[PDB]
Amino acid sequence: TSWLGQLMLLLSGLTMFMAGLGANFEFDLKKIIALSTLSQLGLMMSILSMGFLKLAMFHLLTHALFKALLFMCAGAIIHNMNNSQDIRLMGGLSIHMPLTSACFNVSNLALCGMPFLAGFYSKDMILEIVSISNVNMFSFFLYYFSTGLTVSYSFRLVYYSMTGDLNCGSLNMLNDESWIMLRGMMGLLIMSIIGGSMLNWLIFPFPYMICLPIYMKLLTLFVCIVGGLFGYLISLSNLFFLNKSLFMYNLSTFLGSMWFMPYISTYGMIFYPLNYGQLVVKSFDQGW
Amino acid sequence: MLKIIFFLLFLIPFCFINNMYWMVQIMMFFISFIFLLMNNFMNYWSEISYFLGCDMLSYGLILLSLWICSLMLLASEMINKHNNYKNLFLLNIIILLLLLILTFSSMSLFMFYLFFESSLIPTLFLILGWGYQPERLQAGLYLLFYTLLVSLPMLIGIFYLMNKIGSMNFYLMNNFMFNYDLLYFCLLCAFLVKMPMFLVHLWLPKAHVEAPVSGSMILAGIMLKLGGYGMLRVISFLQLMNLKYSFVWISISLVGGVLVSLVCLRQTDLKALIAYSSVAHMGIVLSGLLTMTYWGLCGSYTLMIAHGLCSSGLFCLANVSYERLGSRSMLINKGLLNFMPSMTLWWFLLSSANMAAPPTLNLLGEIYLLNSIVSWSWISMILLSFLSFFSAAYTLYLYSFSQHGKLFSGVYSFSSGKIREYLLMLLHWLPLNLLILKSESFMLWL
Amino acid sequence: AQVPLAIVSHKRQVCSLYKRALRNLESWYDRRNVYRYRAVQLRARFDENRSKDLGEGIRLLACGQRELFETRHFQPRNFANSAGGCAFEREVIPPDWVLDYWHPLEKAQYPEYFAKREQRKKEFVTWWEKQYGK
Amino acid sequence: PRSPMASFAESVLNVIDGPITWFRESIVEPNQQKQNWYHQRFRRVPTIDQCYTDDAVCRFEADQQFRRDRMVDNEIVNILRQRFEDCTLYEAPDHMVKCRPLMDQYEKATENWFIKYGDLGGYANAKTAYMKQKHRLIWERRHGPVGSGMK
Amino acid sequence: EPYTVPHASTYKVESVPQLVEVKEALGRQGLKDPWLRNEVWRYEPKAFGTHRSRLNTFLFRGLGVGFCAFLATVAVEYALGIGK
Amino acid sequence: GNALTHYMKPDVMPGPDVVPTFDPLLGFKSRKERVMIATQEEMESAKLPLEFRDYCAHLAIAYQACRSDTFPFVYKCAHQKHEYLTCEYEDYVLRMKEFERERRLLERQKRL
Amino acid sequence: AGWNKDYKPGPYPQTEKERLAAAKKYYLLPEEYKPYADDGLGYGDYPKLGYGLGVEAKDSYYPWDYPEHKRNQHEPISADHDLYSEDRWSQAEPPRYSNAYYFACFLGVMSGCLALYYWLDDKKMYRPVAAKQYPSPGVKHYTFEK
Amino acid sequence: VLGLDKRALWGALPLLGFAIGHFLDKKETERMTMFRDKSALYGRPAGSEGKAPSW
Amino acid sequence: KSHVVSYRNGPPPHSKATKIGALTVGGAMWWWVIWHLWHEPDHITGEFDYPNSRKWSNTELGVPKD
Amino acid sequence: PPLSLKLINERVLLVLKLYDKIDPSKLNVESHFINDLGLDSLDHVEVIMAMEDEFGFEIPDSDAEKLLKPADIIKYVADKEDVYE
């Protein structure tokens, strides 16, 4: 009800936008999933600022379901690699890891927004409510642009992991016979297929009504299609292409470092307080 | 109340009989239990005996000392192991405890002062007698001379109050309000020293770093409280004068707390770092105390109890590490999680309490001083945010740096932790939590 | 053993710069087919300078090093199991002397193992005395 | 039990309630003894105004009486807070219309509480509270009610 | 034993069409790749498949069976008079 | 649609969540009235949230009657959900017509 | 083992003969040794070492006596080692850009988008609809059709 | 389970101090009998008073 | 440190359980998605027509005649 | 799993044989790179890079100067993996 709604919407929008781009440059499997988590948190914070509780709560539970599954998949993948999170080493896991890759595919699609998975029921209704209410022009663009970005990096990760040709080391422990790890995963996997629809009939004693023109209701799917193609297609390469990330070196370093936030918060700040400790003790506790 | 005093007096001869070191603590622990049963106190004084009473304020501080002074004997088992004048050592604590019990149980202001400082000399013997490093001299004087220099002028301020009130008894004093500027400085600059205030704390890092483990306990455990306890009794009739100069003390302690926290981050000595952590929290205690509000007073009483148990607790752990690694520097002490993993648990809980972590009694008191200070002036939110932030910055550095990393290379083989050490740590922390259940008693002294 | 001497020949500075240059190249072009293509070209640039005077070479390294640093990747690859890697020395193993402080009943769970260690202790002293002159 | 689960819900509530009621009725209640406990009553004592400036027992009498009355008055506010506390939970979503009178009772009590014990801090005693009243009344007749400023 | 080290003679650069694309480029540029026979093992089709096979399998694994189950689901629904 | 037109020619676009500014009976020979179905007691007894206490309440109450009748298997009440949504769709249309009416009228006054 | 009084720094060195003993006293060859400026806050004759990119920039693969500190047996320790330690303000490689550059970009972007968002706060895209007609007493809500 | 021996027999001496300490202050309360059942807040009603004084 | 290791080679064959599981997971997902599209095709497109406000006549809104 | 020494001997030689600027006949455990096999310094760098990827770690540039024959490389990898069998 107050000015804080104005601010939270802006800050949240950047958070979901920034990691959306950051996820398209990071190369650590463990980190890409982390920015993915953070990117969707901004989505809740923004819709939450609109004034809706069930929508935020509904998506929150949905996020926990499949996002936990993704990390479980990553742990199995990494442990079979030589403890390396980098995606540039991995590749071709769709056949070397049948079961784990299948466990990932469902989770990734849930993030993508394939209709009637866990994520779709939450992402859809949220985007629809955004287009129904009185939103900011800048906020609206970030909402839908991030969804394109959300699918972009996700299939970018598909290429570097499953469809991409193998790029590992000479000695590879590729194996998918860890049943003890797998049984726990199928608990989440079942829920990620029914968690969405189940909660729709329970969370909402008064379902939201929506009636929007076709050329916006279909925008959520269309961007997801563009994002999936754009993320996948651009990920490809050849011998005589242009390393666009290298060419715009300054921009890539900016977006690949999360806008220098780690530097700002870890190397641009700690120098000053710690020096002050010396000047005090140097000049008072053993000086004046 | 005399039940306690005469119990202690007749335990003095146990110092002389041989092979009675361990039979002493049990008599010291048992009396705590007996004292723990006689809680029926109120804001006003109760159980009068010739000049000795006890209210809810004095009770908690007395009971804190009996607990702490009992743990001193557990901690300083090395004195028993090497028969290093243990009999004299025991007599020092039994005498010291009696001075504390009288100091808090005294009903008249002159008495409080009489045993206020008199407890110092048993402490001073403790530092010189059983301290390792050569600097216990140059730290023995600081403790004695900062205190005496500011306590002797307080004696004049006490006598000047007879000729106006006609008596010392605390209740009769509260009926008056004095307007003389110097008198204000002759009854608070004497306690502001012992708190300590940031600019007159130069004795605290020296006394604590050099004193033995037991001396560290009582110095950090009860001596810093006698300054705090004294203020709670003498701002009652300095209310008017307190309003003209409080803003000087609040600013110094608040800014003093922040600056010391940075100083903590640049320390490299465990004993030094814990000692400087005492000044940080004691700045909040003093700050809230001088706010004079109901919350700032009850909260300050609470935090003094909690902080003493914790800072006393953290001095146990530094002694444990120092006893084996032989050096108290942070560089030597690394990765102790990989030598003494069972010990590292106690490091965390005592460390966590120091940073106002729940559900400790420390967080209850700190919530309150924070409330009073904020109500005093919304400008206090600036550093009060910084101080609480940095008050965890060094605590993590203290814990993480000493427990986490890869082990030291030059260290020679040493014993692992013993049951005595674990039992000592439990008695420090475990009350610090369960006390939250009955904060009813150790909070509402007003 | 041998402790490396800090002095590094100019020939070695070129060697190291070549190794860093190639490794940086992998990060930009992950794919092996592309990497091998570009890495070959990178080696060509060095052979077109192999026939030059050292003093001229001093000028080459300076711009050769600066351009590398000016083109450093924002997320350079490492090997997870080695110095700087994300998974380097995760575990820490205490010194041997820990074992000797076990409670005697604890030692009874591995009587063979502690039987052997005490035979080794006898050998170790004689080994240590000879090595360091006792 | 029109709902399926609610039909199952009541089944459990029978299982957890059945034994405890039996246990309460079978062992605890039947075996206990009859005994009554009473409620402290305090005879009102002279206020601080009657006390002389030299006697301490009479001041001590009133200071304790003031403190006991403070507790009663501290928490008569607390009870009124709990009423508005409970109405907001027992009347939602339409709770604004019903809690509004309760909050009006609460806010008035706070001001009367703050006019009496307010701004004394710790060490507030019968003498200080009474003397605030004397100064307050003098200002009232001279400058009117507080909040209007001086003349 | 954990594995057996195959012989260098087995790996022939002409097997992998992708690597051979590199050589014709280097010949045009005038260079030669020594470390090319190493890369061959990564692109063995029978054991690693191609880009097309890995993509088809990854996205549509079980789709054929998934559809077949759905037809049974529609069968039961029709036999329960639900679809209409 | 969009809302730049409101920025560039605000004289024509009524604006966000516009409350009607013309006489409701203007331009109408008559326009019939609107009738509640659910009393205050009925709304309160079912704890109907205040933002849902609009004209559709009775259908919403019917939804809770059925939904509570088969909980948790609320899919056995999917039919009832259709009507409540079927109705609240009408209100959105009425709000739409209410908007266009004002937009069309607001244009007329500019012309004259 | 000795004590602190037996190891505290000597007064600032003034002579070459004094410098050489001072360099000896810290196990340094006479060329490394460099006392602090002695403005008045100096550390006496204590050396000045490190102060570079930090400890973590030291060679990791060298066989250090103390790998944990990345230090040798009797080697002295920089007076500010607690600040340039591996976990404190240090980096493995020189930063890509000047320290000023990073702050400008992040804040420059942030401010550049704060203004844009707030400038559009009025121009909210709204669907073409009137307000909820919540039934209020004594108020007249109609339906369009006759 | 206590693990106490004959040395704890000396403990009776400190317990002796407890009883002596208890006795004196108990004797002191018997010296405090001039507001006993006379204060305005607990004073007995004037007339027909209990034989034994409370406390 | 998986007990399986392969040198310059694809991993060994797969047990029956893993082979089946991959299809069951992937197959189960698709079965769910298809069924919802079959039975609820009105959620991807609007379940309610968005009315063309322009199509409305001036009279039905009661627009007075100029 | 344990990396047998015999495998290290096989793994090293496999890489060298695949390297096209070396002789498969001269190539043996004892041969020198720059002396016998006519390897340049830059060529010797590329070989180490293959060794690094072959076994999965960094061979420091300072310590690569001790690796002047495949036996030394075999010894190095054995020392790092402490497989002395």
Automatic annotation (TrEMBL), chain D:
Disulfide bonding pattern of the chain: 51-58, 87-99
Localization in the cell: Mitochondrion inner membrane
Bilayer topology term: Peripheral membrane protein
Record keywords, A-Z: Electron transport, Membrane, Mitochondrion, Mitochondrion inner membrane, Respiratory chain, Transport
Matches recorded under Pfam families: NDUFB10 (PF10249)
One GO term (biological process): mitochondrial electron transport, NADH to ubiquinone
InterPro entries attached to this UniProt entry: NADH_UbQ_OxRdtase_su10, NDUFB10
Superkingdom to which the source organism belongs: Eukaryota
GO CC terms in record: mitochondrial inner membrane; mitochondrion; respiratory chain complex I
Membrane-spanning parts: none
Similarity field: Belongs to the complex I NDUFB10 subunit family.
UniProt xrefs under PANTHER family: NADH DEHYDROGENASE [UBIQUINONE] 1 BETA SUBCOMPLEX SUBUNIT 10, NADH-UBIQUINONE OXIDOREDUCTASE PDSW SUBUNIT
Listed name of the protein: NADH dehydrogenase [ubiquinone] 1 beta subcomplex subunit 10
Source species of the chain: Drosophila melanogaster
From TrEMBL, chain E:
Main location: mitochondrion
GO molecular function annotation: oxidoreductase activity
Keyword Mitochondrion: yes
GO biological process, one term: mitochondrial electron transport, NADH to ubiquinone
Membrane topology: Single-pass membrane protein
Subcellular locations according to the entry: Mitochondrion inner membrane
GO cellular component term of the entry, any: respiratory chain complex I
Highest taxon above the source species: Eukaryota
Keywords annotated in UniProt: Electron transport, Membrane, Mitochondrion, Mitochondrion inner membrane, Oxidoreductase, Respiratory chain, Transmembrane, Transmembrane helix, Transport
Parts of the chain that traverse the membrane: 58-80
Entry function: Accessory subunit of the mitochondrial membrane respiratory chain NADH dehydrogenase (Complex I), that is believed not to be involved in catalysis. Complex I functions in the transfer of electrons from NADH to the respiratory chain. The immediate electron acceptor for the enzyme is believed to be ubiquinone.
Family per similarity comment: Belongs to the complex I NDUFB3 subunit family.
Protein name, per record: NADH dehydrogenase [ubiquinone] 1 beta subcomplex subunit 3
Organism: Drosophila melanogaster
Organism lineage: Eukaryota, Metazoa, Ecdysozoa, Arthropoda, Hexapoda
TrEMBL record, chain F:
Record-given protein name: NADH dehydrogenase [ubiquinone] 1 beta subcomplex subunit 7
Alphabetical list of InterPro entries matching this protein: NDUB7
Gene Ontology annotations of biological process type: mitochondrial electron transport, NADH to ubiquinone
Membership in a protein family: Belongs to the complex I NDUFB7 subunit family.
Species this chain originates from: Drosophila melanogaster (Fruit fly)
Cellular component per GO, a single term: mitochondrial intermembrane space
Compartments where located: Mitochondrion inner membrane; Mitochondrion intermembrane space
Membrane topology: Peripheral membrane protein
Gene name of the encoded protein: ND-B18
Keywords tagged on the record: Coiled coil, Disulfide bond, Electron transport, Membrane, Mitochondrion, Mitochondrion inner membrane, Respiratory chain, Transport
First-listed, main subcellular location of the protein, grouped into a coarse class: mitochondrion
Organism lineage: Eukaryota, Metazoa, Ecdysozoa, Arthropoda, Hexapoda
Coiled coil: 89-112
Disulphide linkage map: 56-87, 66-77
Any single Pfam family the record assigns to this protein: NDUF_B7
Role according to the record: Accessory subunit of the mitochondrial membrane respiratory chain NADH dehydrogenase (Complex I), that is believed not to be involved in catalysis. Complex I functions in the transfer of electrons from NADH to the respiratory chain. The immediate electron acceptor for the enzyme is believed to be ubiquinone.
From TrEMBL, chain I:
The entry's keywords: Electron transport, Membrane, Mitochondrion, Mitochondrion inner membrane, Respiratory chain, Transit peptide, Transport
Keyword Mitochondrion: yes
GO biological process: mitochondrial electron transport, NADH to ubiquinone
Topological category with respect to the lipid bilayer: Peripheral membrane protein
Keyword Transit peptide: yes
Principal place of residence: mitochondrion
GO cellular component: mitochondrial inner membrane; respiratory chain complex I
Location within or outside the cell: Mitochondrion inner membrane
Quaternary structure and interacting proteins, as annotated: Complex I is composed of 45 different subunits.
Family: Belongs to the complex I NDUFB2 subunit family.
Function of the molecule: Accessory subunit of the mitochondrial membrane respiratory chain NADH dehydrogenase (Complex I), that is believed not to be involved in catalysis. Complex I functions in the transfer of electrons from NADH to the respiratory chain. The immediate electron acceptor for the enzyme is believed to be ubiquinone.
Protein name, UniProt field: GEO11417p1
The organism's taxonomic lineage, starting at the top: Eukaryota, Metazoa, Ecdysozoa, Arthropoda, Hexapoda
Gene this protein is translated from: ND-AGGG
